[PDB]
Each structure stands twice: as C-alpha cells, then as structure tokens.
C-alpha cells in the first residue's frame, strides 16, 4: 500500500514540477551574447607534494590556500609568492578533504580514518598543533566545511552529514536521508543551508538549524562527485560520473540546464563558479578542466595543463584566480 | 615591511628542508592495499607481518612496507578504492575453501583488474586456507562442479608443482581456482600490471618474503617498461 502511495506523492510532486516549467534557461538565454573564448593561463604552479592532491581550499583572504595530499601532508601555500607557510604532517596518509577556516586560525582535514582532525595555526608555540579529533562517523570523511571557528559540517561515506561543535568535539546535528556515499558539500553564502551530493544520483538541500532535508534533486544518471552553490545561493551545480554537469534551481525545484558534450565521456571530479556565476569551471578525469557558459551550456574554454586526473578546483572569494589540484601532485593557479 | 619577506622566504627553506627528508622516507617505503572478505583470513596474513583504516608496518631485508586494511568502511568500495591508485601492489586474500563465495572473489578481482584507476596496479593474489580446501576435497560432501561446471572438463596444467604427498584431486582443484583468477588477469592485463598468485595457510612462516619478492618483481618490470624492453 505504501509502495503505491510512495509513487503517488512522487507523481504528484513531478506533476507540480511540470506546472512550473513554462520555458527553459536554454531558450530564455537564447538571445544573450556569449562570453567569448575564455583563455586562462597558468600564472603559478605550486610544487612540493610528493603524492596526488586529493583536495584543496582557499582562505577568505584569497591569497593563502591549503592543499591535502595522499602522503600525510597539509601544505598551506602563499599563492602570490609560491611560499610554503606551513606543512602539517597528518597521522593518516589517506586524506580526502581539507578546509581552511573563514577566520584563518584553523585548518581541518580527514579521509579514510573517519575523523575530521582540526589543526591550530595561531598557536603561541613555533609549530601547529592538532586542536581536536572529531570521532563519530562510521565511514570515510569526504568533505568538511567550516561554519565558524567552532562549527564544522562534515559529509561521510556512511551516507550521513554531521554538524559538530569543535569546543566539545561532539556531534550536535546529524543529517540522514542519503542512501549512498555523500561525496561533496557546498555551504550557502548565508551558511543557514548546505546542499549535499551522494553516490545515489541525488542532491539534497539541508537546513542546518532544523536538521531536515528541505528538498531532493534528481536528474543525474550516476554518482554525483562534486557540488557547488551559485554565488546568490538560489541555485547549485553538480558534477557526476555520467560525464555531465547539471544546474538546479532551489525555488523552482527543477533541473535548469545540463553541461554535456558528445566528446566528453569522463566523470566530473570538481565544479566551481566564477564570482559572477556566469562561468562554471568543471574538472574532468580526461586531465583538463572545461569552462562552461552557465547560461548557454557552451564550452567557453579549457584549462589543459595537468598530466593526471584533475582532483579539486576552487575560485578565490575575490575571483582573481582558479586553483586546480591534480593527481600529478601539482597545484596550478590560472587567471 | 620587507622584514617579513626574508622571514617568509626563510620559513619556506626550513619547510622545504623537512620536505626533502620526508620525500626520501616516502619514496623508500612501499604501500600495499590489503583486500579480502570476512572469511578470507587477511587478519592471519597481518599476524604474519610481525616483522577507519588499520595500518601494518613490517620490514624485509631493511625495506619498509606499509600494509593498509580499510576495515572501517561500508560494503560500497567504488569511491575509496580510488585512493589506492599509487600503491605498489594490492594484496588480494581469497578463501579458496568456500566455493559458494568464490564467484564474489572472482567478480571483485575482475572489477579491480578493469578499473580505470587500478589498471596499472599489480595484484598479489593469496589463495588462503589451502589447509581447509585440501580437507574439503577429500571429504567429497561438496563438489566444485556444482558451483563451476567447467571443472568437469579441466585437467591439471603441466606447469604444476604439487607439494610432496599431495592428493592429485587437491592439486587439480587448487590449480583450477588459480586458473579462474588468471583467466581474468590475462584477458585485459597487457604489460601495465600482473597477477602474482600464491597458495598459503594460517601456519605459513612466510608471505613477508613473498610480498617483498613480488614487489621487487613489480619494481623491476616498471623499469623495463620505461626502457621499452618488456
């Protein structure tokens, strides 16, 4: 009875969605001028990681960036001068994520040890210290984004996102709903909501305060590897193993556009938006990042400079540059 | 001021000095992924390396080995297995005595072999629990032909090395299982990576040299590939 009733609400929800699709972003933006040909060039190549870079993050200052590598090292670089400010040796060599605090005082990371370790950079002593270890996840830690100096949100391979309190190290809110490994997180600009992409071809919008799944987005055919909010926080983009990127609207609750080409048959590892949101930077497994016109689905450009799989992307807060990590152990900066 | 510029450049030189010391240790150490199942007996192989994720360190001939057992994860491994694309070898441990779950081990080996990120990582296959397999065959209460009908028209290969006082049925059974894995290994693996089958039990005073010898062979063949010789 519930099996038929489950599809009753899905059909009713889908029916309500069709009542709001009077046009498409493809045909609305049919008349806008294209962005041209985005020709970014490697302005900086950061060397020093022995093994592949799994993730990196930008500081709010748009100059200091942190990168993680599968050799137990958390290097904090100076992008302007190519200088290693810190190089934090981790207990676990298998680290899949890293986050730089908005205040810059802390850095977090974790991976296959199921722990989001918090590192203190502004210690009164010479070197850094491990501030706190977060234990409580029952699978590999895939993402972790700081909210404040004391709140961090972590997405794990145990199909669970958790909101922590670094003061006590306990899990305050637990976000459950995904039936697959949660691989990516993105925080809204206001940090009141965060969107989450899992290995079940679905993305969920979570309320941080309420702790409940506000909306669920489907459209993708395979595992969503990457997710990123739009700058204005009313949309997000996802990248999956089906060699496609999709842009979803929060308010309309429908997929607005798809970023696919016939030549593209490799998964998207990372997505990012330029400061304006007009360019969607997507890293592929074909070793090069494509620049997508986010209002026309046209391939504006290509960042072909990496020898292995492109792991992570990031656009700076001020939008100066794009950092692009890869499995070749080199973090390059494009402008 | 310009005082910070030289201090910043000095701290980078100190950082880089430590990174050179770490790079020597990192390149000198071989990382192995230990795979297997509940009944495989990976633990017993770990117990033999007395010389979220469980790390083992053993030393053979003054070479450091790091074996990783990823025990703290769910049954879905398609995302975290991409972490171990840079390891020297995958230690694949199979319970050769359990024919019911043998096809799962064949399918797991085939997915590993054919993965886009593990298609250059040689597999050291350990066909564990040879003691249990030997006693299982002579009992006769369980037949391999029930689970693998191709066992009916299979004969022991010429290049077989039975142990002294070994029943021929055990040698045919134990080589058929080895050949099932080598059918997958040879179908897609062309010079990029190789399988290294072994037979082992819980009582083996060995498998630390076996991994060391097979890792030496993996490193040798990597060099000969660069020279375009192999």
């Amino acid at each position, epitope marked *: 009875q519930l099996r038929q009733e489950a599809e009753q609400l*899905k059909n009713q929800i889908r029916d309500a969605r069709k009542a709001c699709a009077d046009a498409t972003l493809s045909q609305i933006t049919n008349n806008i001028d294209p962005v041209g040909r985005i020709q970014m060039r490697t302005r900086r190549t950061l060397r020093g990681h022995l093994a592949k870079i799994y993730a990196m993050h930008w500081g709010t200052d748009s100059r200091l960036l942190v990168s993680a590598s599968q050799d137990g090292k958390l290097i904090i670089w100076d992008s302007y001068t190519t200088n290693k400010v810190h190089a934090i040796p981790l207990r676990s060599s298998w680290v899949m994520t890293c986050a730089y605090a908005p205040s810059g005082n802390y850095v977090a990371c974790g991976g296959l040890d199921n722990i989001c370790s918090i590192y203190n950079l502004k210690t009164r002593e010479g070197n850094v210290r491990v501030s706190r270890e977060l234990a409580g996840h029952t699978g590999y830690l895939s993402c972790c984004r700081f909210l404040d100096d004391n709140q961090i949100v972590t997405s794990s391979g145990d199909t669970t996102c958790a909101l922590w309190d670094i003061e006590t190290g306990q899990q305050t809110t637990t976000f459950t709903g995904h*039936t697959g490994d949660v691989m990516s997180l993105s925080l809204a600009p206001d940090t009141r909501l965060f969107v989450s992409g899992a290995c079940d071809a679905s993305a969920k919008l979570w309320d941080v305060r309420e702790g409940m799944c506000r909306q669920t987005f489907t459209g993708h*055919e395979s595992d969503i590897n990457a997710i990123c909010f739009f700058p204005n926080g009313n949309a997000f983009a996802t990248g999956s193993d089906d060699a496609t990127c999709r842009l979803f609207d929060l308010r309309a609750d429908q997929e607005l556009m798809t970023y696919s080409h016939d030549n593209i048959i490799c998964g998207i590892t990372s997505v990012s938006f330029s400061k304006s949101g007009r360019l969607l930077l997507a890293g592929y497994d074909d070793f090069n990042c494509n620049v997508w016109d986010a209002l026309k689905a046209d391939r504006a450009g290509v960042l072909a400079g990496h020898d292995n799989r492109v792991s992570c992307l990031g656009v700076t807060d001020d939008g100066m540059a794009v950092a692009t990590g890869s499995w070749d152990s080199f973090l390059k900066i494009w402008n | 001021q310009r005082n910070e510029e030289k201090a910043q450049r000095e701290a980078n030189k100190k950082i880089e000095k430590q990174l050179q010391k770490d790079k020597q240790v990192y390149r000198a150490t071989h990382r192995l992924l230990l795979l297997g199942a509940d009944n495989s007996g990976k633990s017993t192989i770990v117990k033999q390396m007395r010389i979220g994720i469980f790390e083992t360190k053993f030393q053979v001939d003054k070479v450091n080995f790091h074996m990783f057992d990823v025990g703290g994860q769910r*049954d879905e491994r398609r995302k975290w297995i991409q972490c171990f694309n840079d390891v020297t070898a995958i230690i694949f441990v199979v319970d050769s005595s359990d024919y019911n779950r043998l*096809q799962e081990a064949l399918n797991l080996f085939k*997915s590993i072999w054919n993965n886009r990120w593990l298609r250059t990582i040689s597999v050291i296959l350990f066909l564990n629990k040879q003691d249990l397999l030997a006693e299982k065959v002579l009992a006769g209460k369980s037949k391999i032909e*029930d689970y693998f009908p191709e066992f009916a028209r299979y004969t022991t290969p010429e290049d077989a090395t039975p142990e002294p006082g070994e029943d021929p049925r055990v040698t045919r059974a134990k080589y058929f299982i080895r050949d099932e894995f080598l059918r997958i290994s040879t179908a897609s693996g062309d010079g990029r990576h190789y399988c290294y089958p072994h037979f082992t039990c819980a009582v083996d005073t060995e498998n630390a040299r076996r991994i060391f010898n097979d890792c030496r062979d993996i490193i040798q063949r990597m060099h000969l590939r660069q020279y375009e010789l192999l």
Partner: nanobody
Amino acid sequence: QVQLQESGGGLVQPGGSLRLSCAASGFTFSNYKMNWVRQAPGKGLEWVSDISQSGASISYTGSVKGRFTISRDNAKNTLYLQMNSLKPEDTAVYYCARCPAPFTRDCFDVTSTTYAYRGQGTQVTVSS
C-alpha cells in the same frame, strides 16, 4: 530519476520456463553494462549474470550456466533473463542491477546491501 522496474516471476514447477523483464528508465540504457542479482531467503545477495552495452560479452555465475539466457534490447530499454530448467535452489528475489559508471568494464558494489542503481526485484518462488 534512475528507475529499474522488473516484471514476471512467481509460482512455477521445477524444470519450468520463466522470463523476467527489467524495464529501465531515467538513464541511457545503451551506455551501461547491466546485471542480474538474486537474494535467496535467509542469504546474502548473489550475482547471477551480466551483459555488455551491445550484448557481445555475457557472463554467468556457474550454477545457472546453460539454463539462464540474458538478452538486452537497447531499442525498448529492457533487460531479460530467460529461465529454462528451474530448480528448487533457484527460489529468490531477482533484482536487475546496473553498473555505477556509463562506459566502464567494471561493476563495483552491484551486490551491495544498499546499492542505489538496483530494482525493487521480483520474487521467483519455484516449487512443486
């Protein structure tokens, strides 16, 4: 939305012929390697058979070799498992599984406890 609905299966005598159709939707059928997985009552999930994108390559578990025939129809987006000589040991719930990635020779996690790209399944109860 990725959906895999299976039809057929139910009560049948030993040695009977039974056909399962898996209607796949919400993805490009022709790109993915398909699979068949069964779960015997009070037992773990077991892999039965797989078919490639085109149908050139086929595999079987060994217990169903020479009795089960797997065919795909790219045109109708359907997956088939033709049963010929059933046994009382074949009673299980048959799920039609799909490879996670769209152009790959490897099926990872198809027989997992909570795999996402599997159908609800059809009970195939075979008895006298």
